[PDB]
Amino acid sequence: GNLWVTVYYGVPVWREAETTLFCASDAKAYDREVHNVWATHACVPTDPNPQEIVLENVTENFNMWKNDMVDQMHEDIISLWDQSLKPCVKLTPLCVTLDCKAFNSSSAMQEMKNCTFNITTSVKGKRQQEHALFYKLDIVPLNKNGRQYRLINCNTSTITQACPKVSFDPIPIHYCTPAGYAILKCNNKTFNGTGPCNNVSTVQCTHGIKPVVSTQLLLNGSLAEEDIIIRSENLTNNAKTIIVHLNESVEIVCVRPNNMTRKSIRIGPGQTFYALNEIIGDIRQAHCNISKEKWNNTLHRVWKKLVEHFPNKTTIRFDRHSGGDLEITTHSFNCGGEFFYCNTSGLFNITYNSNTKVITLPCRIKQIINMWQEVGRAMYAPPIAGNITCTSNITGLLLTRDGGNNSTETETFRPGGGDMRDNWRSELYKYKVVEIKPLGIAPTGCKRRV
Amino acid sequence: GNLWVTVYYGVPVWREAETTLFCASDAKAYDREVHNVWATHACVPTDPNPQEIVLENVTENFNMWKNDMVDQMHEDIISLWDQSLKPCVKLTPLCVTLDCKAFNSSSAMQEMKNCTFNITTSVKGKRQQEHALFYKLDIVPLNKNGRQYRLINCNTSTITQACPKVSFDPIPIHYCTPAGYAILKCNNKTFNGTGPCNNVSTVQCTHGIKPVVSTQLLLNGSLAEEDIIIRSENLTNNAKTIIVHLNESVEIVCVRPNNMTRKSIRIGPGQTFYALNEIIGDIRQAHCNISKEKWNNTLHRVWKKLVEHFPNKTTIRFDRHSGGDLEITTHSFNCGGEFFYCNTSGLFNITYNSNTKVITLPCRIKQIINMWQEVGRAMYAPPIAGNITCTSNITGLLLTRDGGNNSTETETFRPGGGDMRDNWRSELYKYKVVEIKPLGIAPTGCKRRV
Amino acid sequence: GNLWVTVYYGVPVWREAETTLFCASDAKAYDREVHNVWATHACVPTDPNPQEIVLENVTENFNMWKNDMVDQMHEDIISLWDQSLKPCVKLTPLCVTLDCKAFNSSSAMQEMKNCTFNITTSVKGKRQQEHALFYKLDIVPLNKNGRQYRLINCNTSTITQACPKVSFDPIPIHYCTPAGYAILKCNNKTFNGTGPCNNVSTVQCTHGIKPVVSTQLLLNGSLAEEDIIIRSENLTNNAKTIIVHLNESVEIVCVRPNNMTRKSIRIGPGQTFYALNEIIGDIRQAHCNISKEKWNNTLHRVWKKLVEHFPNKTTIRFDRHSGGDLEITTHSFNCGGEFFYCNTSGLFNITYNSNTKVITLPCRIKQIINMWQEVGRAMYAPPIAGNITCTSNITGLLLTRDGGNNSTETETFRPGGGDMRDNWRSELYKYKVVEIKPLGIAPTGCKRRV
Amino acid sequence: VFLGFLGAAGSTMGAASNTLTVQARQLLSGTVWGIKQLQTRVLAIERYLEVQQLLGLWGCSGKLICCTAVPWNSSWSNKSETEIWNNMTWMQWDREISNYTNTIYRLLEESQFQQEINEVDLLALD
Amino acid sequence: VFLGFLGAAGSTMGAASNTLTVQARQLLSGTVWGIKQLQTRVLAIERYLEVQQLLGLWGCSGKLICCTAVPWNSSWSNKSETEIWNNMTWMQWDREISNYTNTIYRLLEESQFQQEINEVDLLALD
Amino acid sequence: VFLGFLGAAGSTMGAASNTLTVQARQLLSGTVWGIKQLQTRVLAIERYLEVQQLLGLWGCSGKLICCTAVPWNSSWSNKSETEIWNNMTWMQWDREISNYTNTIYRLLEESQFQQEINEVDLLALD
Ligand SMILES: *[C@@H]1O[C@H](CO)[C@@H](O[C@@H]2O[C@H](CO)[C@@H](O[C@@H]3O[C@H](CO[C@H]4O[C@H](CO)[C@@H](O)[C@H](O)[C@@H]4O)[C@@H](O)[C@H](O[C@H]4O[C@H](CO)[C@@H](O)[C@H](O)[C@@H]4O[C@H]4O[C@H](CO)[C@@H](O)[C@H](O)[C@@H]4O)[C@@H]3O)[C@H](O)[C@H]2NC(C)=O)[C@H](O)[C@H]1NC(C)=O
Ligand SMILES: *[C@@H]1O[C@H](CO)[C@@H](O[C@@H]2O[C@H](CO)[C@@H](O[C@@H]3O[C@H](CO[C@H]4O[C@H](CO)[C@@H](O)[C@H](O)[C@@H]4O)[C@@H](O)[C@H](O[C@H]4O[C@H](CO)[C@@H](O)[C@H](O)[C@@H]4O[C@H]4O[C@H](CO)[C@@H](O)[C@H](O)[C@@H]4O)[C@@H]3O)[C@H](O)[C@H]2NC(C)=O)[C@H](O)[C@H]1NC(C)=O
Ligand SMILES: *[C@@H]1O[C@H](CO)[C@@H](O[C@@H]2O[C@H](CO)[C@@H](O[C@@H]3O[C@H](CO[C@H]4O[C@H](CO)[C@@H](O)[C@H](O)[C@@H]4O)[C@@H](O)[C@H](O[C@H]4O[C@H](CO)[C@@H](O)[C@H](O)[C@@H]4O[C@H]4O[C@H](CO)[C@@H](O)[C@H](O)[C@@H]4O)[C@@H]3O)[C@H](O)[C@H]2NC(C)=O)[C@H](O)[C@H]1NC(C)=O
């Protein structure tokens, strides 16, 4: 009849908590190829045959918006960029007045500039005039007559050139908990990012995640299994970003077609700077190519999905970005070490009523980079000789709704971004971190002796 | 009848030991204001409602002279100064010959110098002549005609300028033991620093201690509760310093009255140096103010206390410091980021037989600082625009006795210092560190089974 | 009759494993003398009266060729060199064209060069011509007329000068395991380096090992107790090095006889470079001295030992090194901070059939050092005033066999090296690292209760 | 059949009382980056040490589950044994008794100390 | 009434035998600066581990206080039980038996090993 | 006579069953360099913690050696007791039973859990 307290150790019970985790790269990343930005010696080899355990009859409330290990991901990727940035060459002497002239490009007007400037020689008391090729975006005029120019970051900070051996290829990264912690994965294929998840599993490490840096589009990410997924912290709040997850990728082919040449210039003792020499052949603008019918079907699918979460008899307009800096207004991404800034007006140039051609868009190239919207920390991109082609997969979209006055029966969406944390949020939506509390209490008819 | 060994775990028994501790700052120090020299991200938030436990019927022998966590305090404050010193600007190019002229100061003679010198411009191959205002103490003549001058530390080391956002305001710091250690506090209000203490308590963390850097005087410290306290490792040994603890503070108001102007000069890429421009208005010497009657009553009290520890029919003379460097001979302290060196001859200008006026003293300003008596590590103080007023509390004194030949019935005392460790010793006198030895043995009539 | 599993904790059983260890220096190394390259504050004081425990009736298979804590020794000594290298002065401005003239050396021809060059003064915009003394090896000609010269590493890297307080004296280093690990020592005096060892002991720390950097010879090492020991991973494989261990040392006296002078030159702010001034007295080549009869008896002993591991009716030729860089072809070592490169043709100039004079050899001095065969990391050696004498002990030899075509009844050996790991292998041959596995299982007639 | 990590979390607690060992073995299993791995390993080990000490202070060290002499209070839960051990999961049970974890814990330390000092007093006269 | 950390240090040892738990819970409670916090936490945890192993080697693991079979030697102390347990503090008692801590300890390990191997031999024939 | 660290390794296991304590006390005994000393101390302490937990999970925590209720299988070894305990060293014995360490271990956890839950069920009706 009487009952007694019984202490239980190892109970399968968890609680919500915030903690730090550790990285793990694949073993094949250690077979040479250490000359990569995300190549980390601290990332342990990935555990072979990882264990994913399905927790039947378990319901958990996921929420990826106030989720942890997203700010931690941002801090880790920033620290990795900075640690790769430290051992390379800082371009202090390159803040020198440049005589820049337009490129005739005879057998991209004003985009190419031939700039001559004085560089310090092997003797610190001597200077030599030398030329280089530069873009219009990464240079600014000193005056109004368009003769004297200076670097954009000259009165801001000092650029650090990327070391040429280091490669900007994203690599998969597994996030693993320490002892006493666990990662829960939502196996529900129609999960919208927040709320209960009927099918739950547990893993020691997440799947390999490539840290792809992009805006207005998501590249080389995961894909939804069943249907297009709309994720928002508050759909009626237009100030919050909207993440669109596709069930099928869209092939994107971005090509820099010109033939470059790399010139190594001795700036100081042990300091070599790589400049752009004369272009072999014709000069043409870089571009990206998208199948017209695939993109049209994609837009119709996402329009039909967006009809559900809004009034049905509401027309939907797609428009380009309103304005701002070039980093947000255009699709900025990495392609073979060269950073592309591609105009995206064509893909958002259609409105839908309530009832083998290829779209080709222009792209520009910048060499002075301020990534994660940082001020005072800038990167110089060395050129790559020859031509560059990158074929990738469109697997996600980032959209922003504008504030409509009352109910005008119209809602417009423009491509947004700016927060790279959202770039990790579309891949970490299904994962959450829990803390084990193995101690437990239960009443039982068992009584201890004396 | 027979007895047996019994093992006891968790016994309240401690032993004297030396160990390292950790810092803890208040939570309100984390509400912005990270731009402070002692602002430390490693200092954990202070434990709310700290537990002080009175150990009744416990007598312990405190001794603050060979006490630990005093050299540790000195090492911690030195490391904090150096860590704040690293990310700022080093003034390598400022070691350049200066043409310095006297200041007329028409509608402090030779104290102000207008110095013109060549500074490197935005181009490393160009120089521009520019002027600045400097003191007489922080500059030295190159020759005997008084025309060419150089910085004092030019042939010693390279100065590092304090970053202007960083503030020299002292903040309270709590010292906390790790697990297995404890801090014992002597609650006896008449404790002289060494010997037994009848009233003992234990705390996890000490009270908040502001690391005030001063000599010949103690500022913003704790106060005795009952009477003036004289602390000395050996009173008959004149070579040991004497610490005087007052039961009531003395208000001190130190003012730099002149109106300054700060000029930002671009030295190199990303390097800005802040110089003193022309003085708005009249030029007047800085000064500190002390109430005459309060200081007289203070000196009479400390004389009456010093009568006890010496022969009664012995006259006592107060004299200024004999000589040495300016850091020890004058009261050097911090006031609004500007470092003051105040003559203290007036306060020690009285002898006592065995039987609304305000004392005002001069002060000078130095910008080249060698603190903790270090050689090869120097600090440049940026000026602060406008006027500066600091009101503080005199809560302690540092005195040194001179060697009298036999018994001349006279003992003279002069203000001393030099060892900043003593500055932490007047606030850490009541605290000691002990190590727990929880294992214990006792004979009891209890016997274990087989 | 029945038996049961019984669990045993603390069983004396070990297994082969690879792990990291820690360093321990003697306490007398902490009595000042911190100005040493291998002086390490992390090396704990050596445990007084270390315990060596003889494990009777124990046979273990030692193998020093694929042994661990040898690559770890190399990494530790490289990291110690680099850590001593960091806080000193880097010679960036010394890459300047030098006008070098031959030394008449009136009352070593072309070995001494008087080089005049422009050095930056206290003002960065001023240069002054100054002279120095340099060797022929550490300078290279810019052109074919032999007038303009440059430093050897000028187009490779930037040298870092050794700080003059730091001393290159080797000190003993004890290697100690953490908890759960052990070091086994082979007490067999005739152990050849691999295979079973009948007499085994265990120690917490190894004996003190001086990290002597040398090639073709081993200096100040341990000595065999009984006979000359030949150690090889594969004797028939000529591509593997051969280590010869003597039972008696050979006295070697290496002297730089010239009288030097050190000149301190202010290069930059806080930067002082030490150059060689005029030589006081006559100029003579450095040399090392070896007793002729002792070396002859040594060579006869090692020839008789080498007869055993080869066909008996095979003549043995000793020859000098075939060729390569000066670091391997000559005996390179440290002597009073000056690095000697001594020709070793005389000691390997004898062939042996199957049936008070002193050998004196020349030596050269290099100041630009690339040690551990590293490229891009170079060291400048400051001169030492006066003369230098080092007396050391020859305790080991490094030999390499050449590939003879079929059986020509002759085998030739030349002095080799290059791998400093072998220098630690001749002192770590008797030590191995094992991991304790204290859990054990045994069948016993004891049964637990219910 | 073998059940993995947390596999009986959705199970009833009576069936989940057979798979404590997997959580037991999982509870310790394993410059700046080195600092973070080091600190988080230290965090895991001292969490395990605190849990093991809390088990030891109740006279239940070294045992997977352990009975005590604290009588069960109906104010914490008036539920029957059968519904707890054949229908009730561990998650919502922890949610239910989260209000009284501290009271049950303090009763546990107090009962252990009282019984053990009673044993000491009993053997004192022996 | 609750007594805090070290509150029974000045008390007699008989009254101080009721407040071991507070010291028990206090014994583990919690770039360059990170290195020092890390090392001192490591120091605390391995000190606790060494203390717990020394308790385990005497057959007294997991218990607050524990009796053994070593007979008490009058050479260590000829004091009566009543004066020890009603007038004598822990501090000066540790000062008194500081000479014989090591001898009492070694007798403890030796008695534990002998009794436990006697138990093994007794159950061997069972 | 005192025997040092690993002094009974070459001895027969019957004589070596008297010197477990020396290995027991040895098992925990003790910027970039600081990182390596710190990590290797952490490695030693968590190795000891894992060993102690593996001892605790077999119902043998706090004891130097401990008996269980797993019957010995002749498939592991058909050797007699006398040759094992008067001629057989620990090294080659570990070499022999290295094939069945895991099977013996899992039988140990399973027997401990089954006996202990049988005790729980037996005291449940009490
Ligand atoms: C989404 O995912 C897609 C699919 O992976 C990806 O497209 C591919 O990107 C990779 C990585 O940028 C591209 O591969 C590069 O291609 C060229 C040359 O390789 C070509 O030729 C070889 C030989 O046939 C083929 O195997 C290869 O597939 C290509 O056709 C080079 O730029 C790159 O090689 C360098 O990097 C490698 C790193 O693994 C090294 O192994 C290699 O040795 C090269 O390094 C050398 O050069 C570097 C530059 O100077 C220097 O840093 C190094 O030190 C060293 O000197 C690389 O192989 C591939 O072509 C793309 N595929 C297509 C169809 O376009 C998308 O980029 C990705 N999207 C996003 C946004 O991340
Ligand atoms: C013993 O203790 C006494 C009592 O506290 C102390 O006297 C006081 O010292 C403090 C600290 O130096 C003085 O406060 C400073 O005062 C001025 C301006 O503040 C006045 O005005 C405001 C507005 O009414 C009042 O709240 C305030 O009390 C003053 O009247 C400034 O120099 C300082 O402000 C800067 O520092 C603050 C740090 O907390 C920041 O919050 C603030 O934003 C300012 O920072 C800005 O300027 C800095 C300088 O350029 C720069 O580094 C920052 O990045 C930022 O741009 C500060 O508030 C106070 O006036 C003193 N009181 C009296 C009566 O004189 C003694 O100094 C102390 N003695 C010793 C030896 O330590
Ligand atoms: C194998 O082992 C042998 C035997 O030990 C060894 O030979 C000896 O080497 C040592 C170390 O190089 C030599 O000692 C040096 O000698 C001179 C002057 O010392 C002489 O005079 C004193 C006084 O009578 C005697 O005690 C001494 O034995 C010598 O006769 C100096 O070069 C060295 O002194 C400096 O270093 C010491 C470090 O311990 C300091 O204590 C000392 O103050 C000196 O430092 C000062 O000068 C340094 C140079 O500028 C500077 O760096 C410091 O900051 C400071 O200003 C040292 O005592 C000894 O003479 C050798 N013995 C013989 C017979 O030749 C072999 O070298 C060794 N072989 C190898 C390959 O390692």
Ligand SMILES: *[C@@H]1O[C@H](CO)[C@@H](O[C@@H]2O[C@H](CO)[C@@H](O)[C@H](O)[C@H]2NC(C)=O)[C@H](O)[C@H]1NC(C)=O
């Ligand atoms: C960019 O400008 C530079 C001038 O700095 C041009 O380089 C010159 O080319 C001519 C024609 O071959 C040579 O005679 C000169 O000696 C070159 N000068 C230098 C400094 O190299 C360069 O050709 C221009 N680029 C293009 C595409 O016209």
Ligand SMILES: *[C@@H]1O[C@H](CO)[C@@H](O[C@@H]2O[C@H](CO)[C@@H](O)[C@H](O)[C@H]2NC(C)=O)[C@H](O)[C@H]1NC(C)=O
């Ligand atoms: C300190 O000296 C400088 C000279 O370097 C004075 O600055 C000059 O002031 C006059 C009068 O207004 C101007 O014409 C010059 O152009 C100034 N020169 C520079 C370089 O700025 C400065 O006035 C002097 N300070 C005082 C208080 O007289």
Ligand SMILES: *[C@@H]1O[C@H](CO)[C@@H](O[C@@H]2O[C@H](CO)[C@@H](O)[C@H](O)[C@H]2NC(C)=O)[C@H](O)[C@H]1NC(C)=O
């Ligand atoms: C090496 O060359 C320098 C020249 O740079 C010689 O130094 C000169 O010596 C003469 C004779 O005493 C002096 O008049 C000059 O003033 C010296 N010049 C400098 C720059 O110091 C030096 O003597 C030469 N060394 C030898 C051994 O002859």
Ligand SMILES: *[C@@H]1O[C@H](CO)[C@@H](O)[C@H](O)[C@H]1NC(C)=O
């Ligand atoms: C200094 O003078 C300036 C003149 O612009 C004035 O604005 C400022 O208030 C003055 N400051 C003081 C502290 O008198």
